[PDB]
């Protein structure tokens, strides 16, 4: 349910456009993700020429400060629910996710 999603640990998601060359080489995105370590999986929505792609990042885990400081630049970040979390029936749990509703 909605409250089960909203409580489950959230993750950072940036939505970058197609317009970005590879042989600069795209180190700008990698440099700005380095400075803010933590524990949030970074997702990338690349609106390509045909089909909306889904790209979870690599090693970098954000610390929930890099959302606002990234929106300062020409990127549209979000604090979306983490996809990988959706499973199991403990830790939260499903009882505790009914409490906020």
């Amino acid at each position: 349910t909605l409250e089960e999603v909203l409580e489950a640990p959230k993750a950072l998601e940036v939505e970058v456009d197609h317009a970005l060359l590879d042989e600069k080489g795209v180190a700008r995105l990698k440099s700005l993700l380095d400075e803010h370590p933590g524990s949030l999986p970074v997702y990338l929505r690349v609106l390509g020429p045909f089909g909306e792609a889904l790209f979870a990042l690599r090693e970098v885990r954000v610390g929930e400060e890099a959302l606002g400081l990234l929106e300062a630049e020409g990127y549209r970040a979000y604090l979306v629910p983490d996809r990988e979390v959706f499973l199991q029936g403990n830790g939260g749990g499903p009882k505790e996710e009914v409490v906020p509703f």
Binding site: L2, E3, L6, E7, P100, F101
Partner: protein, 135 residues
């Protein structure tokens, strides 16, 4: 009268108060005074309509009366008008939020039950618990 329709119960009882042009509750009135003004004018123009009331005796015809003096309210926004807020509580907020509008949500709030949510769903508990999670 389009505003007078939008009327969501007690919604417009404050709306008439907030963008005003009244006279300290306004003698012999009423709220709105902007109900009478278009009756005086008689929309759209219309020559055989705004004369009627002036002959017996929109905005300029309304300013031509009128119970002006007072000067209260302005917008359209202005005002007047375990975890919780908190700390304490003003507003401005002293724990969470806001990059307001959010400010405004803490002033209608007090007091003093938590949750709920009301109206209803559903993020005032989450933002609260999330704000407690960073000690």
């Amino acid at each position: 009268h389009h505003h007078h329709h939008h009327k969501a119960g007690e919604a417009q009882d404050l709306a008439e108060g907030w963008r005003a042009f009244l006279e300290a509750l306004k003698p012999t009135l009423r709220a709105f005074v902007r109900e009478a003004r278009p009756h005086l004018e008689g929309k759209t123009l219309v020559l055989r309509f705004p004369e009627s009331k002036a002959f017996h005796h929109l905005l300029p015809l309304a300013r031509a009366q009128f119970g002006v003096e007072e000067l209260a309210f302005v917008l359209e926004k202005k005002s007047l008008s375990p975890p919780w807020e908190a700390e304490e509580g003003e507003d401005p907020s002293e724990e969470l939020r806001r990059l307001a509008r959010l400010l405004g949500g803490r002033l209608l709030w007090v007091r003093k039950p938590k949750a709920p949510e009301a109206e209803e769903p559903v993020s005032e508990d989450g933002i609260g618990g999330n704000g407690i999670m960073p000690p």
